[PDB]
């Protein structure tokens, strides 16, 4: 590197116009192949999560979480390394992107985005709302360790992760969910959906879900 590209903003500028997986090299200079979406909101997006039709278990320990898991065809989650490794140096707004059964889009936008490595548990540090029509359901969860239901770190007597089936930046517990199970709209389950809460409650389970980033 140094010669190549940095950022799925980069490949953007080098006239990539359109989504794909291309490899960008890290700051590390390791080289990654990811997901750009050259797309929305003026493109030059890397996604780091996207559930789309319920293909993949997102249920997963803490080490399937640390590597990544999923699919380039489909559904997957860059892996904690990665997404640390993405926005460790310089700032990376924050862009979630979902999509209802319907085809009724949303999303929120906030200014910055950055994650802790594994020691300091991927701790989530996020900046500030900037709009969106799904509405906060982020930073409630901010300044919060990473964990799964084989690595408890919540502020809450039992497994946050546990009871709602996922994976996330868990309190006690949660105002979003968006690696909770795929159940397809309405659920009679509380809460352990891919859910926003301010976007459509705790019993909606999202068809689309995305989650991105780009250099401010
Ligand atoms: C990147 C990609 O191929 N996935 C698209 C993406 O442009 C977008 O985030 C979402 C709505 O914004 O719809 C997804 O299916
Ligand atoms: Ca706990």
New binding site residues.
Partial sequence: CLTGPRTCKDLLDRGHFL??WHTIYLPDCRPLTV???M??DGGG?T?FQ?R?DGSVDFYRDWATYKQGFGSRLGEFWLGNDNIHALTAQGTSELRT?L?DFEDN?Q?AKYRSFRVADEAEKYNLVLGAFVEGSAGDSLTFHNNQSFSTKDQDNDLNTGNCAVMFQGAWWYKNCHTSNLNGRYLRGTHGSFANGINWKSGKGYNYSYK?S?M?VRPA
């Fill in positions: 989504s794909g997901l750009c979406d797309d929305t997006w996604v996207r789309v992107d999509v889009y999303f689309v995305e991105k």
